[PDB]
Design a protein around this nucleic acid. Structure first.
Lengths: 113, 58, 50, 257, 58, 125, 80
RNA sequence: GGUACGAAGUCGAAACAAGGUAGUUGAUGGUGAACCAGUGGCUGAACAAAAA
RNA sequence: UUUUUUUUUUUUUUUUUUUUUUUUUUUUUUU
RNA sequence: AGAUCAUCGAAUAUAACGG
RNA sequence: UUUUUUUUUUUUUUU
RNA sequence: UCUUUGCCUGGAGGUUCGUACAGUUGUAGGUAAAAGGUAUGUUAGAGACU
RNA sequence: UAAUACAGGGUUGAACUGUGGGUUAGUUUCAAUGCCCAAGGCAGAGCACUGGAUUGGAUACCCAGGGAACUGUGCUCCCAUUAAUAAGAAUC
RNA sequence: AGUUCUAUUGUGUUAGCAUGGUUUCGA
RNA sequence: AGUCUUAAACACACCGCUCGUCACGUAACA
């Protein structure tokens, strides 16, 4: 079924790295009989509290990214472990794609009225 | 047509919580409706509120 | 009389499946990368043959 | 003093266990949710891959198998309450739980659920046998299920009673029967190559022969075993067995798991 | 609210009046017992006053 | 047979006007005999359950004691000459189940046929 | 965590507000429990007993409010 | 070794009621005698115990 | 022993469901 | 010629035929 | 000096 | 009011595949009150106040 | 007990089915703590054990040290034995 | 009562993650 | 000190009630 992943980058992440990261991911998708949906960006985001990640340093903000995909359910574990090894990525989460609530079909009239 | 109700007895047993410092259920969890419970209409006469959601398709 | 209910059941499920197709169509339209990769694929195909 | 420990696993038991999981993991070339080509034509080629069985989950994969088997014994469209359909539906559910128990072994809560389904399916055969005898035989052949007739009450002896666990003897070769270990049938102690002595609580699981409770040709004679001789049908070797799932003398049915 | 790890099952009326919210005697079930009325005889109890009975009519 | 013994609990009530009862073929026949003696005001089959009225006189009901003799687990039978000894010097009502339908104890002795004691109405010891 | 600023108020008055803050969050109750090791069996009975006494206290607290309110106003309700 | 009954002497204050600083129980350890230390379960559990 | 700071290791029930609201719908004569 | 509850001594159970 | 107790000790730090 | 499973008869007591498997309340020297509880009184280094 | 994978149970809607059941050995799973065996270790706790108190004549109450016991697909159910002291049908 | 489909999920199992009492360290 | 509330295996009611080791004597399962 469909899946969603929210990746929070750091200040030390250039556009070079972002393209590389996404290319790697697509390998797995195809492996498991899948296809990418769409890739979007959310810009920067302010963090409530300082993030202290070992062997990385301390950061106060980062770049939030979002990308949708679809593959076999067994591919979630492989993807999750790959992100953790790679540098730059300080925090990430995978959320299953719902029917009504989604970032694709439901993105308007949230805060207003 | 005329048909009579069936027996209320069903398979399984009553909910049981494992003893000891490790809190865990054995057969059933807290959300278990016994076969002798009353109808839902009488238990919740108030019904959904005005501010409640009309679509629980989460 | 059982055969009469058979036709009604087919119509009931047919309407349910119709609404399902609409949801999937939204995704396709809303999807940018899908279209972009698809578009590119087609172009190369004709260039190689020509 | 001997120590009570688990018995070793036979070489054939491990080989058969892995083969069972391989069959359950097979993914045929088909579609889920009855996504016929009519509706799929409206979608892009890229998007269609996601809808294939290869990209489906376990729940969707298991549901597809039920639909294919149901149609084989479907009396009318949109009809699943008939005993013929229920017999096939229950068979697929039992295997689905059995496969899960192999990977997950700490889930002791579902052990009790499996027994309920096994007993429930047994009662279905009893009711279908008296209402339709010809149909009861046809369904067994397609599913390769050991057909058993219910014409006389079952005896209280466990060595000759019925066993719902070994119903699918053809499909399962490691859950047919075993040896007794109650009082006198206990295994003798032995010494491994470890500088220690151990004892097995349960006897080893041997590989049974293919001719388990099957007809055979008899020879005419007149002795204690045959005071009145041997019937003509017995000589040809075509008599129908009433209780083919009998463990026989000096044997016990296999455990639940 | 707190997550209890078990439950208490008392049997005596001494501790049952503390753990339970209340021990008030509800109306008897008409299907099992009759409805109480003021016309019933009073209980047979002698009058006492600090341990000294008063059985005189002056 | 089990449903027959379930009628005594419903019909044996003081503070009540009408009580329901499960529908049964044998239960319908029993009510007919009781109405003749003047013990039941009336009854009506309401589908899956039968509504039976209660008769009262000066507060107290007409029925004061019900004894179930026959039970689903066994069967009580008495010869024509033995029923008289059992039932003597009393005003009670014994339901007798004979081959030719259901009749009271008074009629069973008249015909001299061997009946079956089902239940007792207005019976002492 | 709680932080308060003193502005045109005596220290005693300000200190009375922070003291009551811990009661709502049970800061004092939790601090003492962790100091000593409590057996699991004791918590099984203590957790249940607190579910019957506290609810009764709320009902009695409201009753006292009516007595004080009615005392300053006199009058009394009846089956009118 | 252990148990019953009668008489009755010495050495101790275990149960009752929070004083032995709660006390019966499953499986162990220890101590001249009440039995004692630890873990699990129970009440046949005493004291204390919320507003903005 | 107190305070402060910057990434080692074991462990995982503090917060989050509740006026016990069906004819109140159920516990055992008497003192 | 047909049918025709077994009980006490505390209790300790599967045995005999043919490949 | 610190810690601890109804009270006290044992133990730990040494310019 | 009706169907079926399981269990008890006042309190109370026992020698000083073979060291394995199975199985256990009962054949006494002794006794006439063990015990649930509504109420009263008393005690309490147990809570409150004229 | 947030995320994800596998598979159960409960509530409601449609279709199907058209008496399918209650109890349960010569039967079968699971089952706190303790003990044997095994795997183990570098935290927080502590039985036994000479480690600082007793008495109005005897002690484990009050501190500290302290090598058993605390994660098991196993052997395995002795108990105050896990959601009242009935597994079902009828009278609201 | 039971089977199929659809909505719902502090019920069983689950390897890395986040936070936190204690503990540990001092270019 | 006088009352109120709660608990109690005592009610010749705390000078109450009750248990264990050891010493002597009479006996049945040896």
């Amino acid at each position: 079924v469909f899946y969603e992943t929210f990746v929070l980058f750091s200040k030390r992440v250039q556009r070079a790295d972002i393209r590389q990261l996404l290319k790697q991911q697509e390998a797995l998708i195809t492996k498991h009989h899948g296809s990418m949906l769409a890739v979007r960006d959310l810009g920067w985001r302010k963090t409530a509290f300082r993030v202290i990640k070992p062997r990385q340093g301390i950061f106060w903000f980062g770049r939030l990214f979002y990308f949708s995909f679809g593959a076999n359910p067994a591919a979630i574990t492989e993807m999750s472990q790959s992100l953790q090894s790679t540098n730059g990525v300080l925090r990430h989460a995978t959320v299953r794609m719902k029917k009504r609530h989604n970032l694709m079909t439901y993105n308007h009239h949230i805060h207003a009225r | 047509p005329v048909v009579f109700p069936h027996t209320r007895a069903r398979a399984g047993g009553k909910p049981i919580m494992m003893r000891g410092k490790s809190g865990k259920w054995h057969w059933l969890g807290p959300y278990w409706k016994p076969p002798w419970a009353p109808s839902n209409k009488a238990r919740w006469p108030t019904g959904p509120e005005e501010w409640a959601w009309s679509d629980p398709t989460r | 009389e059982k055969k009469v209910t058979q036709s009604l059941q087919t119509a009931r499920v047919s309407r349910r499946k119709v609404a399902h197709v609409l949801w999937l169509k939204k995704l396709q339209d809303s999807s940018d990368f899908l279209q972009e990769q698809e578009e590119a694929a087609r172009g190369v195909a004709a260039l190689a043959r020509a | 003093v001997a120590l009570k420990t688990r018995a070793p696993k036979s070489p054939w038991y491990i080989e058969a266990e892995k083969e069972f999981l391989n069959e359950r993991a097979q993914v045929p070339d088909a579609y889920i949710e009855r996504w016929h080509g009519e509706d799929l034509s409206k979608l892009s080629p890229a998007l269609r891959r996601c809808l294939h069985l290869r990209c489906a989950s376990s729940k969707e994969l298991h549901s597809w198998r039920k639909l294919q088997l149901c149609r084989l014994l479907q009396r009318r469209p949109f009809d699943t309450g008939s005993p013929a359909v229920q017999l096939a539906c229950l068979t697929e559910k039992i295997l689905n739980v059995r496969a899960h128990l192999l990977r997950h072994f700490r889930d002791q809560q579902k052990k009790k659920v499996l027994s309920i389904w096994l007993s429930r399916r047994h009662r279905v055969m009893k009711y279908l046998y008296r209402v339709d005898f010809n149909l009861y035989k046809y369904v067994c052949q397609q599913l390769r299920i050991k057909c058993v007739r219910f014409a006389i009450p079952d005896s209280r002896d466990r060595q000759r009673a019925i066993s719902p666990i070994a119903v699918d003897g053809d499909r399962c070769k490691f859950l047919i029967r075993q040896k007794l270990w109650k009082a006198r049938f206990r295994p003798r102690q032995l010494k491994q190559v470890d500088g220690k002595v151990v004892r097995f609580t349960r006897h080893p699981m041997e590989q049974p022969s293919s001719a388990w409770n099957l007809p055979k040709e008899h020879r005419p004679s007149l002795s204690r075993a045959w005071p009145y001789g041997v019937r003509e049908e017995r000589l040809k070797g075509n008599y129908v067995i009433q209780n083919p799932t009998a463990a026989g003398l000096g044997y016990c049915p296999a455990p639940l798991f | 609210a707190p997550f209890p790890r078990g439950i208490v099952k008392p049997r005596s009326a001494k501790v049952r009046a503390i753990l339970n919210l209340s021990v008030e005697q509800r109306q008897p079930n008409p299907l099992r017992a009759p409805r109480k009325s003021l016309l019933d005889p009073p209980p047979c109890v002698a009058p006492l006053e600090k341990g000294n009975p008063k059985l005189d009519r002056q | 047979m089990q449903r027959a013994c379930e009628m005594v609990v419903s019909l044996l009530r003081v503070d009540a006007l009408s009580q329901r009862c499960p529908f049964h073929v044998l239960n319908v026949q029993i009510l007919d005999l009781l109405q003749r003696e003047g013990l039941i005001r009336g009854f009506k089959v309401d589908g899956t359950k039968i509504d039976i009225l209660l008769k009262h006189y000066k507060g107290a009901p007409v029925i004061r004691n019900i004894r179930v003799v026959s039970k689903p687990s066994r069967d009580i039978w008495l010869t024509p000459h033995e029923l008289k000894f059992r039932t003597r010097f009393n005003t009670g009502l014994w339901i007798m189940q004979t081959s030719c339908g259901v009749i009271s104890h008074r009629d069973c002795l008249r015909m001299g046929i061997g009946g079956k004691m089902l239940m007792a109405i207005n019976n002492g010891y | 965590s709680c932080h308060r600023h003193v502005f045109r108020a005596a220290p005693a008055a300000v200190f009375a507000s922070v003291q009551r803050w811990g009661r709502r969050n049970n800061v004092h109750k939790l601090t003492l429990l962790v100091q000593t090791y409590e057996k699991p069996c004791v918590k099984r009975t203590r957790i249940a007993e607190e579910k019957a006494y506290y609810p009764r206290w709320f009902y009695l607290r409201y009753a006292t409010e009516v007595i004080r309110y009615s005392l300053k106003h006199h009058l009394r309700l009846g089956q009118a």
